[PDB]
Design a protein around this motif. Structure first.
Motif, PDB file in Angstrom:
ATOM      1  N   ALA B  23     108.379 112.382  59.115  1.00 18.83           N
ATOM      2  CA  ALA B  23     109.210 112.222  57.930  1.00 18.83           C
ATOM      3  C   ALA B  23     110.657 112.651  58.162  1.00 18.83           C
ATOM      4  CB  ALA B  23     108.623 112.973  56.807  1.00 18.83           C
ATOM      5  N   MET B  24     110.829 113.813  58.784  1.00 23.92           N
ATOM      6  CA  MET B  24     112.167 114.311  59.021  1.00 23.92           C
ATOM      7  C   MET B  24     112.972 113.398  59.952  1.00 23.92           C
ATOM      8  SD  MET B  24     113.422 118.041  60.013  1.00 23.92           S
ATOM      9  CE  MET B  24     114.008 118.791  58.498  1.00 23.92           C
ATOM     10  N   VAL B  25     112.348 112.957  61.042  1.00 20.85           N
ATOM     11  CA  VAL B  25     112.998 112.160  62.066  1.00 20.85           C
ATOM     12  C   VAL B  25     113.527 110.888  61.430  1.00 20.85           C
ATOM     13  CG1 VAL B  25     112.805 111.070  64.280  1.00 20.85           C
ATOM     14  CG2 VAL B  25     111.631 113.091  63.906  1.00 20.85           C
ATOM     15  N   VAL B  26     112.708 110.259  60.598  1.00 21.51           N
ATOM     16  CA  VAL B  26     113.125 109.023  59.969  1.00 21.51           C
ATOM     17  C   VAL B  26     114.393 109.169  59.116  1.00 21.51           C
ATOM     18  CG1 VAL B  26     112.390 107.400  58.205  1.00 21.51           C
ATOM     19  CG2 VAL B  26     111.035 107.773  60.230  1.00 21.51           C
ATOM     20  N   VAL B  27     114.555 110.294  58.423  1.00 24.50           N
ATOM     21  CA  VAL B  27     115.754 110.571  57.643  1.00 24.50           C
ATOM     22  C   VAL B  27     116.993 110.762  58.530  1.00 24.50           C
ATOM     23  CG1 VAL B  27     116.744 112.280  56.033  1.00 24.50           C
ATOM     24  CG2 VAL B  27     114.535 111.321  55.637  1.00 24.50           C
ATOM     25  N   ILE B  28     116.929 111.695  59.470  1.00 26.47           N
ATOM     26  CA  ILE B  28     118.041 111.972  60.351  1.00 26.47           C
ATOM     27  C   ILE B  28     118.448 110.713  61.114  1.00 26.47           C
ATOM     28  CG2 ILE B  28     118.613 113.220  62.425  1.00 26.47           C
ATOM     29  CD1 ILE B  28     116.764 115.476  60.997  1.00 26.47           C
ATOM     30  N   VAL B  29     117.496 110.008  61.743  1.00 29.65           N
ATOM     31  CA  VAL B  29     117.863 108.828  62.522  1.00 29.65           C
ATOM     32  C   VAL B  29     118.437 107.727  61.635  1.00 29.65           C
ATOM     33  CG1 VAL B  29     117.078 106.869  63.863  1.00 29.65           C
ATOM     34  CG2 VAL B  29     116.409 109.167  64.547  1.00 29.65           C
ATOM     35  N   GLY B  30     117.840 107.526  60.461  1.00 32.60           N
ATOM     36  CA  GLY B  30     118.409 106.624  59.466  1.00 32.60           C
ATOM     37  C   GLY B  30     119.912 106.815  59.266  1.00 32.60           C
ATOM     38  N   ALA B  31     120.367 108.066  59.177  1.00 31.23           N
ATOM     39  CA  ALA B  31     121.767 108.317  58.895  1.00 31.23           C
ATOM     40  C   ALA B  31     122.627 108.111  60.131  1.00 31.23           C
ATOM     41  CB  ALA B  31     121.936 109.713  58.430  1.00 31.23           C
ATOM     42  N   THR B  32     122.189 108.622  61.278  1.00 27.26           N
ATOM     43  CA  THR B  32     122.918 108.403  62.520  1.00 27.26           C
ATOM     44  C   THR B  32     123.206 106.916  62.749  1.00 27.26           C
ATOM     45  OG1 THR B  32     122.385 110.431  63.421  1.00 27.26           O
ATOM     46  CG2 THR B  32     122.641 108.630  65.043  1.00 27.26           C
ATOM     47  N   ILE B  33     122.193 106.057  62.645  1.00 24.66           N
ATOM     48  CA  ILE B  33     122.364 104.639  62.900  1.00 24.66           C
ATOM     49  C   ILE B  33     123.203 104.013  61.790  1.00 24.66           C
ATOM     50  CG2 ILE B  33     121.139 102.446  63.091  1.00 24.66           C
ATOM     51  CD1 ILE B  33     121.056 104.578  65.507  1.00 24.66           C
ATOM     52  N   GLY B  34     122.979 104.456  60.551  1.00 25.55           N
ATOM     53  CA  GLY B  34     123.792 104.004  59.432  1.00 25.55           C
ATOM     54  C   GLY B  34     125.293 104.148  59.690  1.00 25.55           C
ATOM     55  N   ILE B  35     125.719 105.351  60.088  1.00 26.22           N
ATOM     56  CA  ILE B  35     127.132 105.606  60.279  1.00 26.22           C
ATOM     57  C   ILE B  35     127.667 104.782  61.441  1.00 26.22           C
ATOM     58  CG2 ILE B  35     128.793 107.385  60.883  1.00 26.22           C
ATOM     59  CD1 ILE B  35     126.974 109.272  59.252  1.00 26.22           C
ATOM     60  N   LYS B  36     126.901 104.706  62.527  1.00 25.51           N
ATOM     61  CA  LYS B  36     127.289 103.914  63.682  1.00 25.51           C
ATOM     62  C   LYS B  36     127.570 102.462  63.297  1.00 25.51           C
ATOM     63  CE  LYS B  36     125.318 102.900  68.345  1.00 25.51           C
ATOM     64  NZ  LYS B  36     124.110 102.157  68.769  1.00 25.51           N
ATOM     65  N   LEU B  37     126.680 101.822  62.530  1.00 28.03           N
ATOM     66  CA  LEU B  37     126.924 100.432  62.179  1.00 28.03           C
ATOM     67  C   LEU B  37     128.096 100.251  61.228  1.00 28.03           C
ATOM     68  CD1 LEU B  37     123.308  99.119  62.178  1.00 28.03           C
ATOM     69  CD2 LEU B  37     125.042  98.794  63.902  1.00 28.03           C
ATOM     70  N   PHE B  38     128.283 101.212  60.319  1.00 32.74           N
ATOM     71  CA  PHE B  38     129.380 101.122  59.373  1.00 32.74           C
ATOM     72  C   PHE B  38     130.707 101.134  60.121  1.00 32.74           C
ATOM     73  CE2 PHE B  38     132.455 103.464  56.692  1.00 32.74           C
ATOM     74  CZ  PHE B  38     132.585 102.502  55.698  1.00 32.74           C
ATOM     75  N   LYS B  39     130.834 102.048  61.098  1.00 38.10           N
ATOM     76  CA  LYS B  39     132.037 102.110  61.921  1.00 38.10           C
ATOM     77  C   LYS B  39     132.278 100.806  62.679  1.00 38.10           C
ATOM     78  CE  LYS B  39     131.820 106.660  63.701  1.00 38.10           C
ATOM     79  NZ  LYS B  39     132.561 107.758  64.371  1.00 38.10           N
ATOM     80  N   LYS B  40     131.218 100.217  63.229  1.00 37.97           N
ATOM     81  CA  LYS B  40     131.309  99.053  64.098  1.00 37.97           C
ATOM     82  C   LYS B  40     131.653  97.793  63.303  1.00 37.97           C
ATOM     83  CE  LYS B  40     127.677  97.564  66.861  1.00 37.97           C
ATOM     84  NZ  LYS B  40     128.390  97.843  68.129  1.00 37.97           N
ATOM     85  N   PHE B  41     130.911  97.537  62.216  1.00 37.85           N
ATOM     86  CA  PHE B  41     131.172  96.315  61.487  1.00 37.85           C
ATOM     87  C   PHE B  41     132.495  96.303  60.751  1.00 37.85           C
ATOM     88  CE2 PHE B  41     126.753  95.473  62.375  1.00 37.85           C
ATOM     89  CZ  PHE B  41     126.966  94.240  62.958  1.00 37.85           C
ATOM     90  N   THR B  42     132.928  97.455  60.239  1.00 42.52           N
ATOM     91  CA  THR B  42     134.198  97.528  59.543  1.00 42.52           C
ATOM     92  C   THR B  42     135.303  97.108  60.502  1.00 42.52           C
ATOM     93  OG1 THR B  42     133.554  99.283  57.994  1.00 42.52           O
ATOM     94  CG2 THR B  42     135.830  98.981  58.428  1.00 42.52           C
ATOM     95  N   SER B  43     135.266  97.633  61.725  1.00 40.76           N
ATOM     96  CA  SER B  43     136.252  97.256  62.722  1.00 40.76           C
ATOM     97  C   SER B  43     136.255  95.755  62.989  1.00 40.76           C
ATOM     98  CB  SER B  43     136.044  97.980  63.989  1.00 40.76           C
ATOM     99  OG  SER B  43     136.061  99.374  63.748  1.00 40.76           O
ATOM    100  N   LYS B  44     135.077  95.162  63.235  1.00 43.09           N
ATOM    101  CA  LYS B  44     135.043  93.760  63.619  1.00 43.09           C
ATOM    102  C   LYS B  44     135.528  92.902  62.456  1.00 43.09           C
ATOM    103  CE  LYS B  44     132.160  94.500  67.395  1.00 43.09           C
ATOM    104  NZ  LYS B  44     132.312  94.124  68.825  1.00 43.09           N
ATOM    105  N   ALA B  45     135.105  93.241  61.238  1.00 43.05           N
ATOM    106  CA  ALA B  45     135.470  92.481  60.058  1.00 43.05           C
ATOM    107  C   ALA B  45     136.983  92.401  59.900  1.00 43.05           C
ATOM    108  CB  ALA B  45     134.841  93.079  58.837  1.00 43.05           C
ATOM    109  N   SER B  46     137.646  93.549  59.791  1.00 45.21           N
ATOM    110  CA  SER B  46     139.094  93.581  59.697  1.00 45.21           C
ATOM    111  C   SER B  46     139.718  92.881  60.916  1.00 45.21           C
ATOM    112  CB  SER B  46     139.555  94.989  59.593  1.00 45.21           C
ATOM    113  OG  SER B  46     138.965  95.745  60.639  1.00 45.21           O
TER     114      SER B  46
END
Lengths: 46, 46
Positions: B23-46
């Protein structure tokens, strides 16, 4: 010969007690070794 | 046999903790990957 008979009886009594002693030893040692292995394998497993 | 019961209980406790860890792992990893994709797609989009 009174002595012959006497020694025979003594030697029989002794034989019987040795029998009872072996029974006890097997129980006590059984448990000592039991606990030792339980402690050891639980640690390695985890 | 005292040992059989003991090992069963230990193995049940372990099974439960593993449940909580997943349960814990799924929460922490969820956020790590979340932030990574947000950073990546925002850059490509702009």
């Amino acid at each position: 010969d009174p002595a012959k008979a006497a020694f025979d009886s003594l030697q029989a009594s002794a034989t019987e007690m040795i029998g009872y002693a072996w029974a006890m030893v097997v129980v006590i040692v059984g448990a000592t070794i039991g606990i030792k292995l339980f402690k050891k394998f639980t640690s390695k497993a985890s």
